[PDB]
Structure 1
Amino acid sequence: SDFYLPGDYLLGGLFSLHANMKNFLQVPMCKEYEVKVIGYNLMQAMRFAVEEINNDSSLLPGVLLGYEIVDVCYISNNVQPVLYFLAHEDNLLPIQEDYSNYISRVVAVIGPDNSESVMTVANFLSLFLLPQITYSAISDELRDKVRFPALLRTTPSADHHIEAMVQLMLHFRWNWIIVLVSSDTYGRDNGQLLGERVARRDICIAFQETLPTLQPNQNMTSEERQRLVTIVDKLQQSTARVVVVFSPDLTLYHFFNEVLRQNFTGAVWIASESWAIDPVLHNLTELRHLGTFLGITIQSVPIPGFSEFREWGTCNQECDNCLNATLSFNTILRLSGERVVYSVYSAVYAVAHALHSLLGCDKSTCTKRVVYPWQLLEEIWKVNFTLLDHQIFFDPQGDVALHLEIVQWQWDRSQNPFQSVASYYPLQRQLKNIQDISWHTINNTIPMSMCSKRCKKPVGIHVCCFECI
């Protein structure tokens, strides 16, 4: 199968291959959930990276890099995987005071795509100091290394996402916005971070509301119907026309259906990293009348031959509907480029480079020595190399400075669905290279979202609001 490749040194992987689309004695396996195409694309990216590494005779020569990809659920199953990774070849995990001489089944694990699952896995792995590079995880709590000694990353934290959002707001002069968060911890944390960041940059939030937890493809009670109509009515009543949404892509279906039903138009929606590059949400094509959609993503890096590789191709380690589900998504995924695929690619290559440096081989046979995970983690901090004309090195707080990009949703099946309109550089914390953006206004006039026209006594709590005298 494609979940297992034998090799001298294994490489664990945790990918969200399924999502809860709708008795504790029986455990619901991740197999029966609906297929998530993004997780399968990321798994294909990691497999392609491993195969490319094995192809080259200049990187890890004479040593076959294997991997053991397992399917982690969003939240459901995240203990068994790590137990399987840490056990020996006999599925037995010894317990001892010291783990220095202990060798596990895998030498490094490409972490999950969820902040909470990454936190749980890192808390489990802190004992063994197993190297773990996560992708598409933005929780700020993962930056400190006191409680996550063996955690790395290949994407900037939430601070850079919020900074890019605030810079975009400042460039187009919006000082009156509405923030919508989800009931889960990610949405609340991101909303609080945005509020703290924006309270000191002379931009005032009109109000903040929480969208109820709402998996699609399910029957929703009248209470949450009332909550949704109340939220949308408050949205339409307010004069702010810039809405920033911090919610997983699963929840927003019911909210967007509700606002479409309410016929509210003329707002600039700013998307978080979670649903900025959702193809299964962008395919709706009925949101074109809701205004302009923007989002904060990782720069698209064109990986040569990845699309061709994707097209040519124990328990909780097999999925059947993935290929058929992603077949219908081949065109849009090919056109949209690689944003988190590059993150997984770079994580796998960083692990390979760390292993190559640790083994100490130079374009010839390696020393084929025994490697302990803590040694690999120690050697993985100093990796520095050029990869697809990009520099990959880790900050002291375990982050990789990969440039962000503000992307705009356009609905043209013959062109790129997510068109880059701005570039954000985390190192200098500056947003530049802004290009032409197709607005929803009559002559492309930039949308006006200010709570008071420029004139002076203040009215209300917010400084941004006043009345001309």
Structure 2
Amino acid sequence: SDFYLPGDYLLGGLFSLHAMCKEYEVKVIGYNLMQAMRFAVEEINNDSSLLPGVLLGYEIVDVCYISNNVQPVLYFLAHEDNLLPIQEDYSNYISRVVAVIGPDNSESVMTVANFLSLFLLPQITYSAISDELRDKVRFPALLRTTPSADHHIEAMVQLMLHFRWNWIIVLVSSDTYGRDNGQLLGERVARRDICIAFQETLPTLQPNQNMTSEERQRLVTIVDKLQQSTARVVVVFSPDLTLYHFFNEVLRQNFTGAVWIASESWAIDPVLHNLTELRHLGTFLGITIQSVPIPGFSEFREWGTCNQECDNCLNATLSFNTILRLSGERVVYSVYSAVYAVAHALHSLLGCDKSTCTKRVVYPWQLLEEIWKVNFTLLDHQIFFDPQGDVALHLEIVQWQWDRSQNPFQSVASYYPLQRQLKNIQDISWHTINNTIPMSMCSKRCQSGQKKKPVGIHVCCFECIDCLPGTFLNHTEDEYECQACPNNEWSYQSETSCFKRQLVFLEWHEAPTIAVALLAALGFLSTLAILVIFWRHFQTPIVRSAGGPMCFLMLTLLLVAYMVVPVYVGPPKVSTCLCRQALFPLCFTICISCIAVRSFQIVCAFKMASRFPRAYSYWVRYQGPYVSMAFITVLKMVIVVIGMLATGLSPTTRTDPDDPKITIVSCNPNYRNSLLFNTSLDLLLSVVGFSFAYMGKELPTNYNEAKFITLSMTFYFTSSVSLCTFMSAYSGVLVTIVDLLVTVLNLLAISLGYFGPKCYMILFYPE
């Protein structure tokens, strides 16, 4: 039969022909790889440059997926008489086979390598991707012709990164394959800023049998939890057998819009593509080995003890001939390269010089030692074994195309294990409306100048909350928290660049301030002329019966107040406010006190002289108005000093509600209470002064003093009430100019309503 070929050195094989093994259903891939190995050995026999004059044989034994993994290896290690000796050292042992091409799945390879470790027979497994075969401590004589699952996971991660998918879904199987792949991908993905929405285990369910109600509920739960999630990249680590029911129920629930990523198990499975209803679910990417065109192999394949036979293999392979031919060869080159690796190792071990061979007896451990160091070329591919027993064959991301006229599995990317880089990506026919890359992000990109706030355990998921007014976001420093701008400058909503608050204050060249300046200059000129006239006429009954020194000091203090009026306008400094609050309130209060004491002494003194005679005698012996004036003045310095100690001295900066962009500057941080106290004292003096004037309003006294005092004092009362109501009903930029207006007009009242009629009767009434 074709399962045996005598030669100088046999070369055992282990292929999964069914999934005794005869009663199981036949598999086409096993026979395909079997024919690959046969063709490789046959072409080794043909080639006179490789192994010249040394016939190479083989002994292929059918092994099931799991069931048969012990008897074939014992057959391999038995002598020609079917007896395997037991001894401590096997260096002198000669086995029937010289090497073995291991099974196609991880577990049977693990068993065969565990049992062959004693003898150190080389074993080049193919398409076994488990990473527990990477270490040579427990598998000293195990090799590979297929990149490990590490590179499959790396290709998947690079594919997600290239298309900007950072929110995925992992589905595994109850088997060890799915569990290990899921854990490996989860460990790999946590360091590339890609999150896993959820990982779920698909129950094991072989086809061609009826499912249970509990499993149906399980699947409907899986697909419900799949659909309710916002991730649109579903990676599946599961053998192709149990994925029929899951996809059937997915079609049943009518779920669409997911980019399925397939592991190597079902990325090239024909039957799932043959279902031909998956084309509406979305795109079906997958990871698989690059197809290497083996010359003169399709024609060779088409030309053609126990558990060592098959009958229905050819009939089964007949139906899948066209799909296999158009799809190319994926795992066939793995077996081809493994057989050539053994051949090159044996050729180098025999020390052949492409014409002669020493034909020395070969121990399998010697062949392993030589095969660990093979580096040749094969179909423009370099075949060399890495120190952990692998050869870097290019991987490939393949996108399923539902058209029988061309390749059912069309390549879209190539992965190079040596560089760990995925490159050469072509166009992919997506499932979107206008062929746009599907979006699989959990959190939208935040608008410029917006704080990022994590919402769950996943780092890539967050909520965008805008920065509150007065702060921005420095993306360079940290994008998770707002950073406010120092130096007393404000920021608007969603603003990343704080702007300096412009300092607005009373400037010389403005309309209200120039009006105030003109009014104050008119008052100053009028009162200066009044002083000039008063000094021009003295020894006059009006200026002598009334207080001469009193009026002179009052008018000089009014002159000073007018001259210091313009210090208000300009940049508010410490000296500015100091002189302002030490001159204006002092002078104004001293003027009001003099007016009140004059009205008192001209009206109420006559009435008081009747009840208290000695009080009047004391008042006239001394200078009662002078001492009362000094007492009120010292009270005023005391109160201004205590307000000084309370409210401070440095000019303040307050943000008006009108516009945070502007910042008015006054000199008193607490102006409301300070002006309230000042006006309270002024009005407490004003009420008694006005009452004293009004009780004696008709008396001629010193040329109708009570009448003018009354009119001026009522004018001040109304102006103070106007200030109070304006301040209570308004707070903004015009507060300072209003304070100037009211202060200067109060000064005008005190000047005019108490000195202007004097000048009137002096100039126009010389009688």
Q: Note whether the superposition's TM-score is higher than 0.5.
A: yes
Which of 434, 448, 455 in structure 2 is aligned with 1:443? 434
Alignment of 1:245-264 (within 5 A): 245-264=236-255
For 1:383 and 1:440, how far apart are their aligned partners in 2?
Answer: 46
Which of 447, 454, 461 in structure 1 is aligned with 2:457? 461
For 1:281 and 1:81, how far apart are their aligned partners in 2?
Answer: 32
Map Cα deviations across residues 204-252 of structure 1 (whole Å, 9 max, x no partner): 0000111111111111111111111111111111111100000011111
For 1:335 and 1:365, how far apart are their aligned partners in 2?
Answer: 41
For 1:162 and 1:125, how far apart are their aligned partners in 2?
Answer: 29
> Which sections of structure 1, spanning at least 5 residues, go unmatched?
20-28
Which residue of the partner structure matches residue 117 of structure 2?
126
Map Cα deviations across residues 253-288 of structure 1 (whole Å, 9 max, x no partner): 111111111111111110001111112322221211
* Aligned: 1:7 with 2:7: yes
For 2:230 and 2:427, how far apart are their aligned partners in 1?
Answer: 25
What's the CA shift for 1:193?
A: 0.3
For 1:341 and 1:116, how far apart are their aligned partners in 2?
Answer: 20
Map Cα deviations across residues 289-311 of structure 1 (whole Å, 9 max, x no partner): 11111111111111111111111
For 1:326 and 1:264, how far apart are their aligned partners in 2?
Answer: 34
For 1:321 and 1:281, how far apart are their aligned partners in 2?
Answer: 22
Shift in CA distance, 349/392, structure 1 to aligned 2, threshold 3 Å: same
Runs of 4+ in 1 over 2 A off after TM superposition: none
What's the CA shift for 1:178?
A: 0.5
Which of 353, 363, 371 in structure 2 is aligned with 1:362? 353
Matched residue SS, 2:241: coil
What's the CA shift for 1:461?
A: 0.9
What's the CA shift for 1:365?
A: 3.0
Map Cα deviations across residues 329-381 of structure 1 (whole Å, 9 max, x no partner): 00000111111111111001000000111111122232111111000000001
Alignment of 1:105-116 (within 5 A): 105-116=96-107
Matched residue SS, 1:435: coil
Matched residue SS, 1:35: coil
What's the CA shift for 1:133?
A: 0.4
Deviation larger for 34-43 or 195-204: 34-43
What's the CA shift for 1:419?
A: 1.1
Aligned length: 458
Alignment of 1:40-55 (within 5 A): 40-55=31-46
Which residue of the partner structure matches residue 294 of structure 1?
285
For 1:381 and 1:415, how far apart are their aligned partners in 2?
Answer: 40
Map Cα deviations across residues 88-132 of structure 1 (whole Å, 9 max, x no partner): 111111101110111111100001111111111100000000000
Alignment of 1:54-69 (within 5 A): 54-69=45-60
Which residue of the partner structure matches residue 214 of structure 1?
205
What's the CA shift for 1:47?
A: 1.0
What's the CA shift for 1:437?
A: 0.5
> Which sections of structure 2, spanning at least 5 residues, go unmatched?
447-451, 464-767
RMSD of Structure 2 on Structure 1 (CA): 0.8
Map Cα deviations across residues 163-221 of structure 1 (whole Å, 9 max, x no partner): 00000000000011100001011100000000000011100000011111111111111
Map Cα deviations across residues 142-161 of structure 1 (whole Å, 9 max, x no partner): 11111110000111111111
Map Cα deviations across residues 50-95 of structure 1 (whole Å, 9 max, x no partner): 1111111111111111111111111111011111111111111110
Indicate the structure whose relative CO is greater, using CA pairs within 8 Å and at least 6 residues apart. 1
Matched residue SS, 2:197: strand
Map Cα deviations across residues 299-327 of structure 1 (whole Å, 9 max, x no partner): 11111111111111101010111110110
Which of 306, 318, 323 in structure 2 is aligned with 1:315? 306
Give the TM-score normalised by structure 1: 0.97
For 1:438 and 1:66, how far apart are their aligned partners in 2?
Answer: 47
For 1:385 and 1:462, how far apart are their aligned partners in 2?
Answer: 47
Give the TM-score normalised by structure 2: 0.59
For 1:225 and 1:76, how far apart are their aligned partners in 2?
Answer: 28
For 1:324 and 1:286, how far apart are their aligned partners in 2?
Answer: 26
What's the CA shift for 1:408?
A: 0.7
Which residue of the partner structure matches residue 614 of structure 2?
none
Higher strand share: 1
For 1:237 and 1:136, how far apart are their aligned partners in 2?
Answer: 36
Matched residue SS, 1:396: coil
What's the CA shift for 1:328?
A: 0.4
Deviation larger for 58-67 or 167-176: 58-67
What's the CA shift for 1:39?
A: 1.4
Matched residue SS, 1:225: helix
For 1:35 and 1:466, how far apart are their aligned partners in 2?
Answer: 52
Deviation larger for 125-134 or 32-41: 32-41
Which residue of the partner structure matches residue 591 of structure 2?
none
- Taking every aligned residue pair, what percent have the same amino acid on both sides? 100
Map Cα deviations across residues 381-414 of structure 1 (whole Å, 9 max, x no partner): 1111110000000001111011111111112222
For 1:36 and 1:421, how far apart are their aligned partners in 2?
Answer: 28
